Amino acid sequence: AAAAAANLNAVRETMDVLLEISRILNTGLDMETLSICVRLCEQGINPEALSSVIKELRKATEALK
Amino acid sequence: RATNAQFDSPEILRRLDVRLLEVSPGDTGWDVFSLDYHVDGPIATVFTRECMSHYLRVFNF
Amino acid sequence: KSPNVLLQNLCCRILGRSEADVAQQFQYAVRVIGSNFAPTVERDEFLVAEKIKKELIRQRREADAALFSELHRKLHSQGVLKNKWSILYLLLSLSEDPRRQPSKVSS
């Protein structure tokens, strides 16, 4: 709708702020991946589970290269 | 006691303790060693509480 | 959304490959995420902020230790996320020392 798109703006603010914390910690995630992680934190997610899967998937693009 | 630093008074080395230096994102153990001198009581203001942190910052370098 | 397709979006993000060509990683993903989907330890944004302070003090930038306090301030300011500990613990666990990274501009 319209207020359904101004709500996408109020998240678009946050994903600009979360992009800056991502670069000062020198991480490998970018702007596209972080939008998946935010929806996952909406349902509730364990970040001790999310770090071990990313530590495998980043080696999965290097083992099928 | 296995090198000669053992003639210092027991109170001053007793107040010495080890503190862990700031967490590194999986770097060397050289980054996680500190010495911390216990200060509390009346002398906590004389050896100013604000000063001690910067003093440890000097010892890091 | 639906929790099964969201893990399937993640494996198309990190690997460039199609999703009917990778099916081994998506099985290991349900193995780790499944039956541990809720955090097995409690949330605390207090500790993870003080460890993001512990990394920028170790680089000896005390302007960025208060710059990060303004980014964590903006995170509370929007408030569209209810687990502010989760997304930051992730970036903390994935942290490395840049010795650099001066382009901070916020908002």
Next chain:
Amino acid sequence: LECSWDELWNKVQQAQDLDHIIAAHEVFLDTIISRCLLDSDSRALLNQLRAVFDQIIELQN
């Protein structure tokens, strides 16, 4: 080190006030942080010196 501590020892010895063991300590610290490179101006200089500090540990291999 010897220069700042010499002055600190002198200033605390002659002083009759505990207050002047807090203005002597403060300037003692302000001196140490300006002689070393941890000050806000000297960061760039320290950031230059870090580039030398990688080069030495590479020697270790």
Next chain:
Amino acid sequence: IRRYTDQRSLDRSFGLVGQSFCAALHQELREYYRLLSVLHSQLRLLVWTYDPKIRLKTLAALVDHCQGRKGGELASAVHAYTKTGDPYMRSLVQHILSLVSHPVLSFLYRWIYDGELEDTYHEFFVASDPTVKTDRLWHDKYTLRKSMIPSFMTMDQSRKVL
């Protein structure tokens, strides 16, 4: 002057210095009751009653000026009148000055010897901060409040006491 000294001797929140000023005023008004008794017995005598038009002229200024003052700022209005050169007015203001300086200098015996301030109404420059006695009362727990610094003392005097 009668209205002023009756209200501030039943107002105890004006400090115990406003009531000492009131006590001093009662002493001065007491002597004007001597003269009126002598004058009542004689009953134009213009002359007898003009010399109090010099005294009461001073008295109205003294009272009207010291409105809104307590603590060491009332020691900065009775110190307003130690800046005179007429010995009649200088004698008028002395035996006011001692009474008003007395409670301040009483607190200044528990602050140059052992003791600590305890007053219900602030009349002393120390305006202490409660419960910062954890270990940091060698840092600010005793604020030098400038309004209750007496103006017979100086800054070098008011910092050395603390």
